[PDB]
């Protein structure tokens, strides 16, 4: 018969038993995570191998169908996501070499010492709390020498292998292969191009440039109190003095720099202890909030299958918080719940993830995901942003019934949030641009370190303490760089989340600053959000974005509106101090 | 003790007319400003009731039959009437009910009273003006007693009055299903004799669950004795003036009127006169000028009977519902049941089913019916697709596993089964068809396992490209969601044919009668009229054909000039040549349309006001 009918029949056959194998593998993984033992490891490995083999067989079979005949625009999406030859293009010896390289990279990153003195148990503690210039510099240099110097030729071979594979996959470069995610075709007025993604990022980055410059100048001025002999009045900040091994986040710097230290921060730990919350009232409150918004209930199986506390000393289990969608209408949450405000917010985040998973379950198997890689975390995070407001806490009985808010505390909260929200955008942009350029081959193999440090001095505005030669490979010290993880998602996630927050606050008929906005008891906002949540991956992400904000593309203006009072305060404080950094200055 | 009263003058019985009395509330439902037509046991209007006096002495207290309930009106001035006795023989051999009202309480007893020949209550002293109860000669003894009630103590005046009757007490006594229903009403009156006119709604008084056989009854009075009544007990007493009217209720239809206050204000007898029948049919108190033919000559059918086939076998539903295992949906279990009595009420109210939907038949009305056959079709499906088992629905199940006809006439039951056939690892025993060349005709079963081919090239019994196994397998686990948990589905289909019914609801078969206006129910179909041994019905007990004659006949027409204009009406018999008439009367005129009574025929010819037929036109004049 027609190719379309055969394709539909094949997809109908596939989805059945695709759901089954996926459910069995997910159940094995959940059993291993909740109950760690060798037998569970064997079961998980067997299930994963079976699922992978089935996926390979199905892709091989689906390769026969030509994509030109299909004109349904929904079968085409599933086939395109299915017709992924991928790593099978490389030779068997080449594939083995690539797998060995990746395994060695993972092992060497996991196993790293500078003594004894491992990374997680003590190196992060030093980088966050040493406070000594010499100790921090020594730890930074030791880690760099131990990791980047060794990981150079392995990374070079990895780069050439992956670029060759991407070229063999009818792609210009591996960067193009990554950017292919943000691509939609065949829709008039909504289609997107891979080459469009490299642009439209630098534009919004330049839009927030003055705000980042003011924040950096203020941080430099405030930090001059400590290490008086190491901070220049004009210049780039020393790399190791960011409170992080890489400076990705500036949260730990909040202790040093506060505008009004007398004003205490908002905390509810004492209230939680006094009210004696039993590690289950938190999820009850989260469910009540999500219901009040207008979103559906929580399934009965969620309240008994999922575990929401430590099993005890008898049974061990890694409990990094996670939201599990096992399929066939099964939903779980894995957490070690404790009585903290952070636990409250993260429980709200995971409940938001679960709600998002519930929304699109009616779609076929191939289209059960977010619109792109950036939607899911933003949807999970806007809930925590909305539930973090002092007004929402005051609505609950945990907060004081008679509380007064001052703009000093608002400025403190905004500064603490901005130290994390905007302190990572330039670094993310710089790192992804460097990786894109490396993959494109513009940068010679003998100019990696020089170009990297030039970008760090220019874009990020942070200078290294000591010079390094081409032997070192500093960016390879990052977890995502060495483990083949796309990294642009952490950039667009904030943009999407703030656009969604602005749209919901406008639709909920709220007045005042954006940071004092809550969306509870707003049925219209819930319905509008559901009208996008229920789409899944079926529609192009541009159309889904238009269904909430109303704009085809992302706009950074809501982010600026969010930090506008802090922007004015920073301008007032910096009216006397210098703004900018000196590129030529160096610590040595 | 018991004494036979003497020195009583005997007089012939007297009779009077019931001027629109004896109207009680048929039920306890509040109705305001509404006309309600209802049939029950009521005293017909302007009936001939019996009058008894107490004043010559004339101490009348005979024994009268209790046929279908008694309407008792009492005109009193000193409460001479003391109570009543009901029963069958009233000689302690049968259970008898005594309802008495002495000077202290009200005693309602149901015992085998050895009633006296002349029961009475001989209650005065010259030296002190005071009247007290002194004599109570009702029953010799009471051996076995079932029901006994005593009212709260009260003081009775017991004083005679020299004025006219001031109390009118109206009571209605009925004995239905062993329940003695008494309706009571009191009215202050000022009259010498005769039944007063007007309207009065009787309110319910009591409903005693006595459960006894009542055939006869008698009224118990009061006696007054003092120094002015010399002699023995049988002669030294007086009577005291009082009166009472006795009538019998009949099964009739009445049109009751409710005002804005919810009380009964007016009553209309429905099978009394042709005008009354027209008013009842139009459900209004005003009838405009015109011609009307309501049913036939007036008649209220006596009783109702039911005749259902006799199959005392309990019908086996527990075999199907409480079965060990159920078959797959692609090969669904069919069972046929007949010659059994099914109690659908317990099935409908078992309170353990997730879905119970009956299509084309009311869930409760199907209990008392008759069906030729019943089909029970059982299987197990997924929670999402349970909604697909319904006429006019489309889906995988509705097109490849189980097809339901559009004109369905049965019921669908489905309940959760996650505790029986759900095991860890997957109950890979339930299959379902996923690929089929064509659709399914209603009520079709296919178990073919031939591999489906979707491409051009035929595969010779081998799987591969464009060739798939037709039957897929469900997986069941105790950790799936509600939408994926197994559900057990049973569809009941009712089959009706001209053959004698084999399945019928639990009811009774009452002895049949002939040549009587009865409301009959044969095998679930109801009708009214007279059954004649020979439209025609074949009873399930003797297979004898009985013809249904519509009781009263003769097409009767009524001509009226409007209720507001006048109450004069003309009666036309279309099949009578001038016989069977309400009353011959006068103005008897014979035309091609028939015999007309009550309309004057003139030698002139005016414009046609009220057409009748064959060029005849009539009008109301001076
Ligand atoms: C974890 O697995 C071990 C393996 O024998 C078992 O004994 C134990 O009960 C399991 N714990 C659970 C299921 O909580
Ligand atoms: C694609 O096929 C599906 C069948 O499931 C149908 O519902 C949908 O309308 C079709 N869309 C187009 C554009 O043909
Ligand atoms: C994967 O293999 C198929 C089959 O030859 C081929 O058509 C496709 O181009 C391959 N994918 C590549 C080379 O990226
Ligand atoms: C579903 O949500 C409503 C909303 O108030 C609630 O009343 C009801 O109890 C919930 N049911 C379940 C099973 O969660
Ligand atoms: C903000 O806080 C400062 C802190 O002293 C206070 O003087 C001022 O009145 C507050 N409000 C505004 C609008 O600046
Ligand atoms: C939402 O409505 C509930 C219903 O009474 C109320 O208790 C709660 O305080 C409301 N919250 C907000 C933020 O309006
Ligand atoms: C089936 O078993 C239940 C469980 O006791 C019982 O109540 C019921 O009467 C049985 N029969 C039917 C027809 O449900
Ligand atoms: Zn998350």
Author numbering:
A (entry chain D): 19 to 133, 141 to 613
B (entry chain A): 14 to 68, 76 to 143, 145 to 555, 574 to 617, 633 to 676
Sentences from the paper on this structure:
The SARS-CoV-2 spike glycoprotein is the major surface antigen of the virus. Its function is to bind the host receptor ACE2 and mediate the subsequent membrane fusion required for cell entry. Here we have examined the structures and receptor-binding properties of spikes of the B.1.1.7 variant first described in Kent, United Kingdom (now termed Alpha)10,16–19 and the B.1.351 variant first described in South Africa (now termed Beta). Recently emerging variants of SARS-CoV-2 have acquired other substitutions in the spike including a number located at the monomer-monomer interfaces, at the receptor-binding site, and near the furin-cleavage site.
